[PDB]
Ligand binder design. Structure first.
Ligand SMILES: Nc1ccn([C@@H]2O[C@H](COP(=O)(O)O)[C@@H](O)[C@H]2O)c(=O)n1
Ligand SMILES: *[C@@H]1O[C@H](CO)[C@@H](O)[C@H](O)[C@H]1NC(C)=O
Ligand SMILES: *[C@@H]1O[C@H](CO)[C@@H](O)[C@H](O)[C@H]1NC(C)=O
Length: 294
């Protein structure tokens, strides 16, 4: 059944030579080699770990030793995914039923659900975030409903390796101990992610996957530049799912809607939103991506 989105990829030459369904999406222990440490130490930002201590990175990556840390999905069924961006287009879209009908749902950053479920749904299978944006969302959108990140029995949290805080928070979450060092010292991972503290709950996006995404799909002339978390998440789904629908992502008529679907009234890092919008348009036209528009 996978040959649904894969067929669309091959039928058009442009993306046929741009997709590489072999690069690892997730970083885990069996990939931590002194070779990888050499290269990735020459890149900062989420593209590597220059200036980050071996002790921290080695200690976190030692928890990702299990085979389950390597993949988002476990092993003949079809994988139908929905990626929920936070754009104002979903406001009054009443897309809840369509979003929740998918097998798996990706959400990210300010995934406000209370008060907006009829528009955006309640199902969550994956929650992507940097520690910085997650806590910034808990501060900015607390009154709007976001009093906690989405939780679920079989929900997995996807860490974007944008800063040493992400490794520290990832390491503390798997161990089930409060974060001992760094900017987030004192936080309780259980209060963010719930009672389960295992490697089956928390995953880490591969820095080489992010570099490959930037280089092949979103190499903006702004080149620190990096794609939006939504873009990262959407592209993560494009590489792991058999069909993905995108909701709440920036479109050409973005100006008709508030900044976010959950803002109080109409509201207006280094990203190229115009490039990302053009990517989702081309993916839509090539039939690779179902993009929600109106
Ligand atoms: N107007 C908007 C708002 C958000 N988005 C997507 O939703 C993601 C999450 O938004 P926030 O980080 O504001 O919560 C963004 O990273 C972006 O990819 C969008 O594409 N257009
Ligand atoms: C896919 O990426 C891997 C690196 O992970 C590389 O070795 C391989 O040649 C690439 N294949 C294609 C078709 O781009
Ligand atoms: C659109 O969003 C604004 C704030 O984001 C909200 O006040 C308004 O009720 C929404 N309109 C709808 C859902 O028709």
């Amino acid at each position: 059944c996978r040959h649904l989105l894969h067929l669309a990829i091959q039928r058009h030459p442009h993306f046929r030579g741009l997709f590489n369904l072999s690069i690892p999406v997730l970083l885990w222990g069996d990939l931590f080699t002194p070779a990888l440490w050499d290269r990735l130490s020459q890149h900062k930002a989420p593209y590597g770990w220059r200036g980050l201590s071996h002790q921290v990175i080695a200690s976190t990556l030692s928890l990702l030793n299990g085979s389950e840390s390597a993949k988002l999905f476990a092993p003949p069924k079809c994988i139908r995914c929905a990626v929920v961006g936070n754009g104002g287009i979903l406001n009054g879209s009443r897309q809840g039923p369509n979003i929740d009908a998918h097998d798996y749902v990706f959400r990210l950053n300010g995934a406000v659900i209370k008060g907006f479920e009829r528009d955006v749904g309640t199902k969550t299978s994956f929650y992507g975030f940097t520690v910085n944006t997650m806590k910034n969302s808990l501060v900015s959108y607390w009154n709007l409903g976001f009093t906690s990140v989405p939780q679920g029995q079989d929900l997995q949290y996807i860490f974007i390796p944008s800063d040493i805080r992400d490794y520290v928070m990832l390491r503390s979450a798997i161990l089930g101990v409060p974060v001992p060092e760094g900017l987030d010292k004192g936080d309780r991972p259980h209060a963010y992610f719930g009672p389960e503290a295992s490697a089956s709950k928390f995953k880490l996006l591969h820095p080489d996957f992010i570099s490959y995404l930037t280089e092949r799909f979103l190499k903006s002339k702004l080149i620190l530049y990096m794609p939006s978390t939504g873009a990262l998440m959407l592209l993560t789904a494009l590489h792991t799912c058999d069909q993905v629908s995108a909701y709440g992502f920036i479109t050409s008529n973005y100006w008709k809607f508030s900044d976010h679907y959950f803002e109080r009234k109409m509201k207006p890092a280094n990203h190229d939103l115009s490039l990302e919008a053009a990517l989702w348009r081309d993916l839509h036209k090539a039939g690779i991506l179902q993009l929600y528009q109106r």
